[PDB]
Subunit: 420 residues, 4 copies
């Protein structure tokens, strides 16, 4: 570390000698893990490079479509590039999705009908999916439930997917048509599901039912591993372009990838029956989406490095963390158990102060939920960010970092508010 970097961190940010010694130890400790992620990153960069070349991407795919957007070659080729990367029959990538929940919800709705049953098998889903499902019948929101779609949820057993109950439900209920698997844990204290764990779960599903649609919410997992859920038997997946796969450059949108049958059904929900993905001009965003995809394998691993570094420094400082720095990652999220409300809030506020945009904004608990979100793209979580519900045992979630230098610095700034 240059003398001038250290002087500046101490004077400008009040980073103290205690935190700097933790920093030196943590950075040395994560070196072998980091070399492991570099190998994945290189494979993934090549994977993406190959897809671009096989689709013959050129300046002409950087379209500026208008109106109906009939024959937007840029738009249609990107879908082909995503299908190739995910090893799927089809893909549907659009700026029109307002967030990742929109993509997930469209995949769900598109592939469900009255009297079908949807079954989540990783316990309670992410809060934003509750209205899509219809978990509150005092509200009229056009949920699955309101359209006659039944819902089953399998709690985790011994902290793992209760695969024996999943199989028994499949044997006993012919109306189950789609199983929902969530790759990234939300607000809990449980490790996100690795690709090999998804692979086994699907292997067990197929022993019982070869037809049920297996859907995986892939948000935050893209390019973290050398494979995606589609490589291990997922029929359809969805995610958000302002997380990993947009490389920090995409300004909005989402994707759905998988079997043509299922992707196509989702598209009729995203637009309307009879139109699907055949119309939809793209506002001039195609170059950003392409460049973002190309930079995604790299930026994803900057973020993963940030998470692994955070896990180790916080563990050394005395905090319980999940996952541990040497637990191989499947997503970019890092959880830290503060066990103290003030420590939680001080930490999150620290991340905001480490942010390039709105660094001066004082984070307020809006159970209330506090967030650091000083990013170029509003809501992008590939950029350094953090959030947490305010409740015992005061776990915070950190994710993102356009560069590891930024993530690292953020953590140093934040930890410096908690220990000296």
């Amino acid at each position: 570390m240059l003398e001038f970097t250290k002087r500046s961190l101490m004077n400008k940010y009040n980073i103290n000698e205690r935190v700097l010694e933790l920093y030196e130890r943590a950075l040395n400790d994560v070196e072998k893990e980091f070399k492991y992620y570099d190998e994945i990153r290189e494979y993934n960069q090549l994977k993406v490079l190959k897809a671009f070349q096989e689709e013959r991407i050129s300046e002409s795919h950087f379209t500026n479509s208008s109106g109906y957007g009939y024959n937007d070659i840029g738009r249609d080729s990107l879908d082909r590039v995503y299908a190739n990367i995910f090893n799927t029959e089809s893909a549907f990538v659009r700026p029109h999705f307002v967030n990742g929940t929109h993509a997930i919800g469209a995949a769900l709705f598109g592939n469900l009908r009255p009297n079908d049953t949807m079954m989540s098998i990783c316990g309670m889903p992410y809060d934003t999916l509750h209205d899509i499902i219809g978990m509150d019948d005092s509200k009229k929101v056009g949920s699955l439930r309101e359209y006659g779609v039944k819902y089953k949820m399998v709690d985790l057993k011994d902290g793992k997917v209760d695969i024996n109950t999943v199989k028994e439900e499949l044997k006993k209920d012919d109306s189950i048509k789609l199983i929902h698997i969530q790759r990234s844990t939300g607000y809990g204290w449980r490790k996100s599901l690795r690709i090999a764990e998804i692979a086994e779960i699907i292997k067990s599903i197929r022993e019982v039912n070869e037809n049920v649609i297996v859907f995986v919410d892939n948000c935050y997992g893209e390019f973290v591993e050398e494979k995606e859920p589609t490589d291990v038997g997922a029929d359809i997946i969805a995610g958000s372009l302002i997380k990993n796969i947009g490389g920090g450059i995409a300004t909005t949108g989402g994707y759905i990838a998988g079997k043509e049958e299922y992707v196509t059904q989702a598209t009729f929900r995203v637009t309307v029956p009879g139109i699907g993905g055949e119309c939809g001009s793209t506002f001039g965003v195609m170059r950003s989406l392409y460049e973002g995809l190309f930079m995604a394998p790299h930026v994803t691993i900057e973020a993963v490095k940030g998470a692994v570094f955070c896990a180790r420094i916080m563990e050394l400082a005395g905090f319980d963390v999940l996952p541990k720095y040497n637990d191989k990652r499947t997503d970019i999220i890092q959880a830290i158990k503060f066990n103290d409300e003030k420590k939680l809030i001080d930490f999150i506020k620290g991340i905001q102060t480490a942010s390039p945009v709105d660094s001066f904004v004082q984070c307020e608990a809006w159970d209330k939920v506090i967030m650091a979100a000083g990013t170029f793209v509003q809501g992008a979580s590939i950029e350094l960010s953090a959030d947490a519900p305010i409740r015992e045992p005061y776990i915070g979630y950190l994710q993102g970092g356009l560069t590891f230098d930024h993530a690292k610095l953020g953590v140093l700034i934040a930890l410096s508010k908690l220990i000296m």
Copy 2:
């Protein structure tokens, strides 16, 4: 008093002949009183829009450039308030995210219907693009209303008019009818589009038996053609395309839904998802163009109306049955011409393409049980407030002309097209 240089260019470059120029002079004189009538309406509508801008205090800060989630895009949210004011509705939902007007119409229907509910169309067969929304072919799996348990009834016209007595009989008999669908603009037929005063009476009749059924009007092509909109005469919810009238020729994509807050809000959950609705959705930097387009819409709409009315008269002077007639007061921007001959139809449509500023050199081909042909040489792909024309190829070979960013363009296009049929 066409300038000598204009006449020379038209005759030399476009092979417009003296017979056509004589029809032009007569037609222009014949439609002058009609044009003055539309100017009165335009003035009113221009003022209605200006007041809506000023009441919402539109400023430069509404010309947003939102990203990501688009949480608190003040431009977007204020445009919704401006449209709600113009249409005299509780709410509105205007977004570039709609891929076409069919999407906006579909979202309004899906959002406000549930399994075991019945939707009822009362103006006969809907526009072709709605057939999959409804679910008219049970051999296709397209996620239609029918596939979601929504029943469908359709009331044929009787003696060319909405059969208001059968509509009432259906409402008395069928408790499950939750939404009535009115299409303002006729599609491919030989029937005048429904005027606002006609819609008013239809609704007044519905309200004699049932004050709760949702009255939905597909308002495509009708915005600013009259001094009132369907929402001013009892419509609960309306939908349209921003690349037709209301975009002023400047909007590059999108749609709108307007009406009662309850029904607009339900539509938003179909457009995005339950729980989000219109709370998320950045707008790609399009807001300035949508506002400016709205401001210019009353004007541009009436340029297209004038083109339709002038077309009606001149083709009639040439011997053709047209609909509506030049002096039938309009409710939309569409003009139909019965060519009664396949070649004449095709030649006319190709001539429209050749009169266009974009893709003028493209040779239109007959590209449903019948082939369709289209002239679509426009700055915005598929925009029909720009001069365009289309037709299914079937007897008696009716063609449909609409649009014109300026009346001069529309007029020139008709002369060019007509000079391919008569000499």
Copy 3:
């Protein structure tokens, strides 16, 4: 005529009074023949623009989204060819990179002048924004023509007209005179703008003595107001702003230079740099709006002209001196009104701001109304005035005649009852 609900809304919202509404009905009737005349010109110009589009085979592929160097931006390069066709010139250079019209004008001048050359303005004192380009304050270091050794001469008007005999005497005497500057639109004065036929005669006189001197015309506010442009009557080079007439109210920034290839090319080296010229310059995805703007320009321009003409008549009927009169055939979109009272001027201009769709609530030495979609776009309804005797105000623009008309009624109602 005006619908009852329009009348009521105007009265209730803007306190438009009966006197003003009676003047409206008279003025509108009075200007109808003039309006028919402008419609003939509009029709011709619309056709000539359409023909230029068709001749360049404009297609959706011209709606470019170029990046970096912008090598081979076909939309860019075709628009230049479409303008050159419209203006009947060898070349044109149309770019969003010009920050305003003064930038385009400046580039045309700098590009075609060298040290020891003399520029001569022949319509008296140029618009204030050109003063630094010329270099009229020797206490400022601004990179002016004077700082680069370019001499300047300015011929005053004589009896209100261009002093053509002095122009010719100067040309006979001073062989360093390389460029003559003509300003089509009058600025802040009380003098009618120069019509195309007046420009034709001036250039014919110049050409009696000298066929080599560059004749440059600042064409701002003039585009599509007549059926000809200065390039049709002997101008070697012209320049203007895309946020005035020729952008059709759609263009968001930029400018143009049109004329002989030799002079347009020299201009381009000043806009970028020697050896690059117009060969580089990506265009930010603005191409579709520039093409559409151009297509709608003949129409929008005439809406603004009607607004001026209607304004001239109603204000004359209300008792004010106006220039030009409603029946003086126009060459630009500007209308001047001599208020002879500071408070009447200010109230008028504040009225125009309250009639505006954007920033209608914003409060407003030089006073300005500028509540527009595009910042500083003067094809949109706007007005301005320096605060000095005899308190002349300048109105210009109107995306639609209805908007311009409504604004004049709102503003006039603040002055008379």
Copy 4:
């Protein structure tokens, strides 16, 4: 620890061979300490950018969408401030209006020169693109400095170094010398680019003789490669391109000028016009991308530096002469390789094209690989070479080190096995 499937894919898709893979493992190990060194600089620069953003209080409101004149575009004005903070200068002028880096350099030059002034280049012959700006071909009329009466002196290098004693002698004898031109990055030559410490000494020597002469540094390709910039060691004004380092691979066009307010302001009058300068100029909605690109610039620049250093070592290990050597600390992102053979040169450059994500299939006197997202952006993996003895090729860029690395492997496999 290259994964087995990475290896198989490289061999099977690109015919990468075992010899090249063996050299890869060696070279990667050999450059590790150099890489750790660049990570220290990257961390420092990352922090210095972050501080600049925070000191200017960058917010979502800086992500402007200005129109027309662009008066008070706060995103635009704040970015100038951020740049000025980063470069430790009084002022900066950052605009998408620059068509390339040459435009920015040319404007800084023209803006600060007047007739009878002399410009002196002190690093030998400038980059070819500057020749018309200076005016080196008296048979062309291109608006060059020469055509505006600006004299030119050029001091040849002596024994490969800046001839500082000649520079001082010139300054002592020629009072008309107003600006000194230093080029940081070597062009198409075989000489190491000038390090910041070398620039510091040059300026220190200049200041022993003349405290007033303007010292201009063309900074292209050098941003964020060292922990200081030329403005930190005495430069009065610098210029560069936003589609090179400082755009972070995200900027789609534009350039920057930074330095003393006096000199930057004079440059702005050349970029637009006298009296306007940088006060007008809307920015087409590009602001977010320029801010994010700047934030990512320290990182992306070092990825490109790593690519160059890795290239240097692997190519050295393969038997080629390279400049600089892998262990010569860098000042820019360029790597030169002397092929001593026309075909090897061409084959190498064709390889780089085949490794590109955009236009990878496009076929390619000066040969170039340029399969990039932003047209002409040299921060992305690219290569070029004039075809002349001794067949030196120039490699630069890489949005990620993995990309640069894979490109060198693909290209090198075409030459050895």
